[PDB]
Design a protein around this nucleic acid. Structure first.
Ligand SMILES: [Mg+2]
Length: 210
DNA sequence: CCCGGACCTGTGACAAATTGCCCTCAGACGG
DNA sequence: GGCCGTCTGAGGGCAATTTGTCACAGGTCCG
């Protein structure tokens, strides 16, 4: 299945995209990299890749696409929009999109790589972003270890504001995304909390390959 | 000594959002 | 050439789960 690669600058960028948007984003990077910024998506190809019907695919593409308008990307700073023109459909089952051409160099650069079958069953988008940031440190054999700062997690994954109270952070973000990865990917993940006084400051992740 | 206050934790409620499903009907194409 | 049956996909919806928010009880330490 397709091998995604992207600059580490994209893995660690600050942005908020949905699952459907992130899925499409994987195909743009694949299309662009296999070569002006104009990409294309076929309904019937999307449906076969992610095991959806044509009807629900059409809905996913359509609603994801109109929700890109106004979205921005921050590299740590400098902010850019994803699209510089609305999408449009010349043919039935076919959509044409205009990626901000200034984003091209950020896609292809110190890089991150994973096969698309590894992430395509994940549902929660924060769990996608986390799996991407563990892959950035993975070793050939499939293991690694990394410490991420909690304030840095919140800015980069653009977690919603109420998750600045740590018990909500634990309950609705951390536990679920550790759970999904262990249930939906070929990776076995564990973690431990680093404290300073009463405050929890970092999260320390360990993983291997099954 | 014990207090209110400033921190921290987990859980129960409710509100807001998303998931995979279902149903209709016209477009595009090949037979 | 030209009509129709079939495969697509662009819409309209649902209930069951997931995600996002906050009140409230109960731990610590300090002045
Ligand atoms: Mg869908």
């Amino acid at each position: 299945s397709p091998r995604i690669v992207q600059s580490n600058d994209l893995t660690e960028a600050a942005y908020s995209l949905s699952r459907d948007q992130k899925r499409m984003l994987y195909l743009f990077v694949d299309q662009i990299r296999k070569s002006d910024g104009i990409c294309e998506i076929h309904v019937a190809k999307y449906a076969e890749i992610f095991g959806l019907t044509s009807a629900e695919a059409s809905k996913d593409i359509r609603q994801a696409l109109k929700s890109f308008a106004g979205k921005e990307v921050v590299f740590y700073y400098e902010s850019f929009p994803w699209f510089i023109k609305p999408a449009h459909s010349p043919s039935r089952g076919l959509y044409s999109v205009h990626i901000n051409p200034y984003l091209i160099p950020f896609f292809i650069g110190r890089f991150t790589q994973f096969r698309l079958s590894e992430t395509k069953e994940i549902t929660n988008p924060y769990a996608m972003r986390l799996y991407e940031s563990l892959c950035q440190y993975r070793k050939p054999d499939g293991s690694g270890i990394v410490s991420l700062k909690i304030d840095w997690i919140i800015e980069r994954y653009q977690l919603p504001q109420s998750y600045q109270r740590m018990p909500d952070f634990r309950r609705r973000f951390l536990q679920v995304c550790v759970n999904e990865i262990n249930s939906r990917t070929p990776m076995r993940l564990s973690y431990i909390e680093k404290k300073k006084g009463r405050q929890t400051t970092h999260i320390v992740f360990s993983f291997r390959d099954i």
